[PDB]
Design a protein around this nucleic acid. Structure first.
Ligand SMILES: [Mg+2]
Ligand SMILES: [Mg+2]
Lengths: 77, 76, 77, 76
DNA sequence: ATGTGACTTATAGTCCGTGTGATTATAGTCAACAT
DNA sequence: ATGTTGACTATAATCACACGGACTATAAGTCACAT
């Protein structure tokens, strides 16, 4: 569907595994539904900047380093 | 409101201006509503990635250039 | 399958709803997985007395009270 | 160990005796292993409901009578 | 008769994830009138 | 030109649940040898 979305959803998962988190921890720490974290990674889903922020806080990661990894993923072949 | 959401909006407005675009024209170029655009720039909207993407295409700016800028703006 | 199991299964759910609990709450307080609580109610799984005991403690109900409702459900038409 | 588990077992042993059965015979009647039964009666086993059901069949006691008894036993 | 121990094998119970209908909050989109 | 106020309607986001596969702990079932 959307170019950027699958990149965002890819990076959320990448970080989540890097930090040895599971989906449902992240769902807690991000103060969003269990199934939403799944749905974001699983398919992609069209999240909101506010929701993205919540997830970033949950990944225990800064806006900045998130976007830095976002850029790197976009740039790949 | 949100810090990120504010910086996003600021960035959208910044790029629109360094390109000498009007809102009217930013909305024409991305096929969204001008009041919608207005709203974002006065930070009254919490856009989705999809919408953000349409706005980048309307600004004629790559995702990467946008985020490069968004990062810099984020750091005061 | 087993006669007693689906009865035990039924009564666990009945109580759980009577107390306005959700599976999530229950598996919570029973310190079992929410998958297992679902599994039990769903497909009448074959639990252990120890696990049943945990569920009773989770339902905030006593041995006695449970077995009294168990007897009732068995007796029904 | 568990409180319930001990009284299940106690009950199983109680009924086997009130009937005049040996373990050997409770095992035969319920098509289970004798050491299996001995284990339960010394309370070294944590039955599943299914197993309990087989032991009730062997004792020839309905679920209801078993639980009526277990309750009474439970209340000291 | 019953009670051990110790040793496989079935399965109970765990852990992480997928996929889904139904409801609620809210973004997406477009009016009217402002300046 | 841009701002703001309501609106309607799509959909983001929530909530309670089912379902699967893979792995770990342990109950199920059977030996040998006590007594
Ligand atoms: Mg719009
Ligand atoms: Mg056995």
């Amino acid at each position: 569907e959307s170019f950027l979305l699958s990149k965002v959803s890819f990076v959320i998962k990448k970080i989540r595994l890097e930090k040895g988190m599971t989906q449902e921890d992240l769902a807690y720490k991000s103060n969003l539904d269990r199934t939403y974290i799944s749905g974001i990674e699983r398919n992609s889903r069209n999240l909101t900047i506010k929701s993205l922020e919540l997830i970033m806080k949950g990944l225990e990661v800064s806006d900045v380093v998130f976007f830095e990894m976002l850029i790197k993923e976009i740039l790949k072949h």
